């Protein structure tokens, strides 16, 4: 439904307004039951995650509990590890920039709460290098915490020993990928690996590893504190909890606000954030989960609600839940065209289908914006699109195909007219 | 992506970490597991850039030696990521975000403003080498859509004029109040908090027993 209470919200420091440093955090009481929780043991913590129903919170929303659980298997003499991706690259995502900058601590105890759940020896946080200032904030926060003894040996009074580190990203969206974050951490080129050697099995430095969206790590301590039920109650069925929503582009007050997941879309922009610029009638389309997810046209928006189950019914992905809105004042053919330009300037090129395919769609898309290309080419891009969708080594090729598929699926008449417009003036 | 040796950009340019920098390099290596120094390539290479913006081929070679990694590896990392200059770069090095979110909120205007403000075209740098204009991609901070990254700072939610003001500040004086030069605080609802209006909660609240 929606309408989460501020009291039941998780990052009270969102929008700042409270010292992102420890003191403000102590008034927040973020480090309240940390020793106790870890004392409970890895299993109990992971269990709470399952009860929570917390899905990914990052890109694909895999059940968090089960995922983390995959490394709750006995150590084989290799130190297990925690990797917390804070790349936050998906266009439209400033979701994570908040927790890191505004509430660094929540993530610090998220790390150790999560750490004992997987029995990780240590956690490395890969904040995108672009955010240099952001990094300045977290290690100040990490430094505070150890000074306190909250982390490190004798973590918060626990025999558990966990060390948290921050790693510099270098302006790559793909670094974000789970197998590629690792390789950047490993120091090689940021190129994803194949899934058959799964991340838990082969870890960073060949030591079991797990990767979580920073939001996913951050909520785990509060969910254990509030209990899985409290959390699981807010969401709809499988889709559960309240996910932060970042609305950017063609909305009166673009902002990131956390609301009950499964909140109706027409409402999200209506209640928080602000009205669609030019009236709700001025809504050509919206991309619910960021650039990777397909945009949905207005007909669906009034009805569709932001939860992953509802969106997959709608053929779109909740993803990072970044709402980008396009008024009737925008050349979508060019809007999506720059996202394909966003992906040609960024895919690693390791795999044949993404390398040439994304460049191929970029060339066709640029011609489509001009209208130089004939109408028959439009359904070809479709066929080029699905060749890329199922054949890619990672998901980015998955992601490049979806916006192209959305433009053809709902805005096929407009592209034909741009086709027609150029043919007429000759 | 080919380094054709040039008198300026080639190893004749000797590179070596200042004593202090080497100390920093050591810590960086400590974070990673022992026996995995190679993992510190990115961090160390960055430090080199901090030392010299150009990050010449010589620098890349030094990084390799310092981390005992094959020279090619350093090259791969440098030529793969984008935050590494691999050429001389402007003192200010402004970067304008032009992904759809920003563009939808009129990013193009900002770029145009800069082009003539700077007098230099994108992909190029000012004669004094004070400013280098680059059309970079999503830099995060999308909510404050109109946004650009001057050097390390993130100037956000900027209207065309604001930048001119900022650029002037950069041109005469320094530290031009880096951040969103708008009424909004960070990424709050511009008009008024849609939530988080009430005071934050307290320790232990609604906590399940133990």
């Amino acid at each position: 439904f929606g309408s989460l209470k501020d009291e039941d919200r998780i990052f009270t420091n969102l929008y700042g307004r409270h010292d992102w440093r420890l003191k403000g955090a102590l008034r927040r009481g973020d480090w309240y039951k940390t020793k106790e929780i870890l004392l409970k043991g890895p299993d109990w913590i992971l269990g709470e995650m399952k009860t929570s129903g917390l899905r990914g919170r990052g890109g694909a929303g895999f059940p968090t509990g089960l995922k983390w659980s995959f490394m709750n298997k006995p150590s084989d003499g290799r130190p297990k590890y925690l990797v917390v991706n804070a790349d936050e690259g998906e266009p439209g995502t400033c979701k994570d920039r908040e927790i890191m900058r505004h509430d660094p601590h929540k993530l610090v105890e998220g790390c150790l709460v999560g750490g004992r759940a997987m029995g990780a020896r240590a956690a490395y946080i890969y904040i995108r290098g672009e955010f240099y200032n952001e990094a300045s904030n977290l290690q100040v926060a990490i430094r505070e915490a150890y000074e306190a003894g909250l982390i490190g040996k004798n973590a918060c009074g626990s025999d558990y020993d966990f060390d948290v580190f921050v790693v510099r990203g270098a302006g790559a969206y793909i670094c974000g990928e789970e197998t590629a974050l690792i390789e950047s951490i490993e120091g090689k080129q940021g190129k994803p690996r194949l899934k058959p050697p799964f991340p838990a099995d082969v870890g960073v430095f060949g030591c079991p590893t797990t990767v979580a969206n920073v939001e996913t790590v951050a909520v785990s301590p509060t969910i254990c504190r509030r209990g899985g039920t409290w959390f699981a109650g807010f969401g709809r069925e499988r889709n559960s909890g309240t996910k932060l929503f970042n609305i950017s582009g063609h909305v009166n007050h673009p902002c990131t606000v956390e609301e009950e997941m499964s909140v109706p879309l027409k409402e999200l922009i209506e209640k928080h954030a602000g009205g669609v610029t030019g009236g709700w009638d001025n809504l050509l389309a919206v991309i619910p989960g960021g650039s990777s997810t397909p945009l949905i046209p207005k007909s669906v928006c009034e009805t569709v609600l932001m939860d992953f189950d509802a969106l997959v019914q709608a053929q779109t992905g909740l993803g990072t839940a970044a709402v980008i809105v396009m008024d009737r004042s925008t050349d979508i053919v060019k809007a999506i065209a720059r996202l394909i330009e966003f992906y040609k300037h960024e895919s690693c090129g390791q795999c044949t289908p993404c390398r040439e395919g994304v460049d191929w769609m970029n060339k066709v898309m640029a011609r489509f914006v001009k209208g130089d290309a004939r109408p028959a080419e439009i359904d070809s891009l479709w066929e080029i699109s699905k060749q890329i969708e199922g054949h890619t080594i990672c998901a980015l090729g998955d992601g490049a195909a979806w916006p192209v598929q959305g433009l053809i699926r709902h805005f096929r008449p407009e592209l034909e007219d741009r086709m027609q417009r150029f043919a007429q003036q000759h | 992506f080919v380094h054709r040796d040039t008198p300026e950009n080639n190893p004749d340019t000797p590179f070596d970490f200042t004593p202090e920098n080497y100390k920093r390099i050591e810590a960086i290596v400590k974070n990673y597991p022992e026996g995995h120094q190679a993992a510190a390539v990115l961090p160390v290479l960055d430090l080199a850039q901090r030392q010299n913006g150009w990050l010449p081929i010589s620098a890349m070679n030094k990084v390799a030696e310092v981390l005992q990694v094959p020279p090619m590896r350093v090259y791969e990392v440098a030529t793969f990521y984008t935050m590494y200059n691999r050429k001389p770069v402007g003192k200010y090095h402004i970067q304008v975000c032009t992904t759809t979110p920003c563009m939808l909120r009129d990013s193009d205007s900002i770029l145009e403003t800069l082009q003539r403000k700077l007098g230099i075209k994108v992909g190029e740098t000012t004669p004094d080498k004070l400013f280098t204009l680059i059309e970079v991609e999503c830099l995060g901070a999308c909510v404050n859509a109109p946004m650009v990254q001057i050097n390390d700072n993130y100037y956000e939610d900027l209207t065309p004029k604001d930048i001119e003001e900022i650029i002037d500040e950069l041109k005469a004086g320094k530290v031009p109040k880096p951040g969103p030069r708008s009424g909004r605080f960070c990424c709050e609802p511009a008009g008024g908090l849609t939530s988080l209006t009430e005071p934050p909660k307290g320790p232990g609240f609604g906590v399940q027993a133990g």
Partner: peptide
Amino acid sequence: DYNTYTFLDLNLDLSKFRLPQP
């Protein structure tokens, strides 16, 4: 306001806290 070495130098300061290596 932060310096170019804030991240690295701060980290070095944290080195002492950093738990022993693997």
